[PDB]
Structure 1
Amino acid sequence: MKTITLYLDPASLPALNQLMDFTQNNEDKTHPRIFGLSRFKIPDNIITQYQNIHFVELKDNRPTEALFTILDQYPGNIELNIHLNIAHSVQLIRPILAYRFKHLDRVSIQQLNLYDDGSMEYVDLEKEENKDISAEIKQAEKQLSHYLLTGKIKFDNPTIARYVWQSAFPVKYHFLSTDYFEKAEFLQPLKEYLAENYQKMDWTAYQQLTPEQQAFYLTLVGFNDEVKQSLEVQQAKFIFTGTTTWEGNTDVREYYAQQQLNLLNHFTQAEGDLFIGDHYKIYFKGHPRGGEINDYILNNAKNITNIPANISFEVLMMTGLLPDKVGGVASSLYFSLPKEKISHIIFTALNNPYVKVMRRLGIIDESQVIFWDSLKQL
């Protein structure tokens, strides 16, 4: 019948893996594709090369009703090939299942490919440390079953629910950390349950594409020549990475802005706690959703070369353009960065789930961790 490919992600890391999927499968100009990537604008010159190509907005972590207008265009039996954010998988598939409900006879779910949002999945798993994971799976399995038959979301364990899709669909997980599932002893039943339905995110994907596909991908992720040449400088490089807050609260937005500027100053100034040297070129790699937090850095910093916030950090590792050193606020980008390039990771005590994930992984050592409120105003 007809296979329809849906690419869905309100965040960054899954959309990045999914655009690699699109690249590897881009010889096919007619395969039906729906792009719900909040953080990614397919270039119009590329859009015109394709047909059966669609775009849907996401709101509240899920495709809007406009998804239905698009699917209505394929009146035959359709099998949906779905790519999702793991943390948001339940919401993202919500409207698809509501469409399926109305068109049971002709609409099926072929397969799921799922990708980590990032650290969030691991932070949340860390909170599941003192629970019977075995029992939790079997309960989530049952509750997923009720979701698929009523369309109603009710989960006793919303975290573990994100990993029981194989009880209903052919599934593949792509993990930022397969080492997490191995080292976290409490999660062994999960690891075993997932069996061979998971792999690690493959960062070597880009070097195995053809030159034409490589340029194609860089055009998807917004990685222009200007940025390429800005990083090829004949000098040692430090990239300062920013963060963002998921709180529209103005006072908090400005606080993050103020603290992050102060953090940079600890890195780049002589009097700083994290002073790196005088012999580094300084770059700002802002969070893609930083917004006014990113603006605050640019407006208030000096001798700083901006790498536009929209380019994901991992693209620099695709293209072998990693700097000498990287420091900043704890980020999903630190999970896949070679350990030799970590200057310092800062967290926004002993029982911080995020500190624990990164301690478990070897990303930060037995080191007395650095919170950003623990730093003097320079």
Structure 2
Amino acid sequence: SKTITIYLDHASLPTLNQLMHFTKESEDKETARIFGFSRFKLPEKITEQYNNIHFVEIKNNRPTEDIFTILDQYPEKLELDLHLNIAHSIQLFHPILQYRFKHPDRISIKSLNLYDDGTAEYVDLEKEENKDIKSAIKKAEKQLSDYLLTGKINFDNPTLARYVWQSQYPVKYHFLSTEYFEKAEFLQPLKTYLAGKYQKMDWSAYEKLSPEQQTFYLKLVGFSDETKQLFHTEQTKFIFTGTTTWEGNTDIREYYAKQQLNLLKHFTHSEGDLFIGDQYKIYFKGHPRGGDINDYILKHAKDITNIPANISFEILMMTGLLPDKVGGVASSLYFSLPKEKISHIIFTSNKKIKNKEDALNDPYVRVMLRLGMIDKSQIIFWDSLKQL
């Protein structure tokens, strides 16, 4: 065979993980890699060293048909090591299945490494609490069998079906929150089913890395000396974290931008409801997909040190540059933080949230309550804050 390592993600969290996997094999310049993100994401000085590296667009949660043309370039017997996100694994897999129908003997699936996309997986699991999980796993296993035979996507429980890959392939899951699987009693049958097949997305796996490997990795993820020097001061530090919306609508985007700026003021102004105190130097860590919402903050915010938005927050934890306090909109990043470092986590909702009972039905709120990352007395949605 040749091994083809296929990394189908572009989103911040799974890609951060997959880039570490790549870094661990980076001295091997010959092995074929396919990445589901732009060729311009990584430094060209690095990528041009790899003689069998390709970049494919992910669209509607599937690699495009370019993936067929790439694989057509490899006439040998191939074993595919797939790396993909859990929430979208079914869709991401579809073209690989389609291609394998054409080359069933020559192309085999050697392994899957499955990673949380983010919090979507958790908020989706929250909606399954009253379902019969034992039988959902069974039904999904049968329905995965049919998907592999027919290529057609049909799952009674698309959320639980994300977790049955082991019935067909060697698999390892990388979870944002292993604790969630321990603390959610309704998931005990899944926890049991998955025993020994998962690990936490840990980020100490960056210490396992050699010193030169660590340097390489920072280059891949866009972390430089200049970023490091943003943290040179001894002064205690507060990072305001931003968020985003999958929504081109200008009114929705300008809404986000203005709400976010206002939220920042409630943390940084002595008149604010969340005032953190004068001791802290203030930083901004914009959402990587935040776009013009990030510009708006940088345009209008006084007295703030920007941490470039493309730098994933967790890189701060790996490199030992975490601040003293962090606050902002609910994000996957908070799952990485020790509790004492959290100032306030703030929520958003399309429904007007009018009171505490409305709040407790929000699935994101439920996840964070289940994990004890917030308590019920303090739950804040950002539209409840006054314009400052």
TM-score class, shorter-chain normalisation, is over 0.9
Q: What residue in structure 1 maps to residue 235 of structure 2?
A: 235
Any idea what SS the aligned residue of 1:162 has? Answer: helix
1:180 alignment partner in structure 2: 180
Is contact 2:43-2:219 (8 Å) kept? yes
Matches within 5 A, 1:130-279: 130-279=130-279
Amino acid of the residue matched to residue 279 of structure 2? H
Q: Superposition RMSD on alpha carbons, in Å?
A: 1.2
Gapped regions of structure 2 (runs ≥ 5): 349-358
* 2:371 equivalent to 1:361: yes
Q: TM-score, normalised by structure 1?
A: 0.98
Q: Distance in 1 between matches of 2:317 and 2:185?
A: 30
By how many angstroms is 1:232 displaced? 2.1
What CA deviation, in whole Å up to 9, does each residue of 1:288-325 have, x standing for no partner?
A: 00011111111111111111111000000000000110
Q: Aligned equivalents of 1:107 and 1:40: distance in 2?
A: 29
Preserved contact between residue 10 and residue 61 of structure 1 (Cα < 8 Å)? no
- Residue 40 of structure 1 and its aligned partner are, at CA, apart by 7.5
CA contact (8 A) 1:9 1:38 kept: no
Displacement of 1:142: 1.4
Partner of 2:294: 294
- Alignment-derived partner of residue 380 in structure 2: 370
**How far is 1:240 from its partner?**
0.3
Contact 1:136-1:160 at 8 Å conserved across structures: yes
Q: CA deviation at 1:8?
A: 1.1
* Higher alpha-carbon deviation: 164-173 or 139-148: 139-148
Q: Is the 8 A contact 1:242 1:286 kept in 2?
A: yes
Partner of 2:52: 52
Tell which deviates more after alignment, 362-371 or 225-234: 362-371
The match for 2:72 is 72
- Note if contact 2:39-2:55 (Cα within 8 Å) is conserved in structure 1: no
Distance in 2 between residues matched to 1:262 and 1:151, nearest whole Å: 48
Distance 2:378 2:281 in 1: 28
Aligned twin of 1:35: 35
TM-fit CA distance, 1:102: 1.1
Task: Say whether the 8 Å CA contact 1:9–1:15 is kept in structure 2.
Answer: yes
The reply on whether 1:283 has 2:288 as its aligned counterpart is no
Q: For 2:300 and 2:280, how far apart are their aligned partners in 1?
A: 19
Q: Deviations over 1:108-141 (max 9, x none)?
A: 1100001111111111101101100111111111
Number of equivalences:
378
CA distance in 1 between counterparts of 2:255 and 2:375 reads 28
Partners of 2:55 and 2:10 lie apart in 1 by 13
Residue 368 of structure 2 aligns to a residue in which SS? helix
- What is the deviation of 1:10? 3.2
The answer on whether the counterparts of 2:38 and 2:55 sit within 8 Å (CA) in structure 1 is no
The correspondence of residues 310-325 of structure 1 with structure 2, limited to 5 A, is 310-325=310-325
Cα displacement string for residues 213-253 of structure 1 (whole angstroms, at most 9, x for unaligned residues): 11100001100111100012121111000000112222111
Residue 352 of structure 2: aligned partner: none
**Deviation at 1:145?**
1.2
Query: 1:374 is matched by which residue type in structure 2?
Result: S
1:208 shift after superposition: 2.2
Normalising by structure 2, we get a TM-score of 0.95
Indicate the residue corresponding to 2:91 in structure 1. Answer: 91
Give me the whole-angstrom Cα distance separating, in 2, the residues matched to 1:232 and 1:154: 53
Q: What are the ranges of 5 or more consecutive residues in structure 1 without an aligned counterpart?
A: none
- The DSSP-based 3-state class of the residue aligned with 1:298 is helix
Q: Deviations over 1:31-68 (max 9, x none)?
A: 11111136971211101222111111111111111111
The aligned amino acid for 2:153 is I
**Contact 1:10–1:39 under 8 Å retained in 2:** no
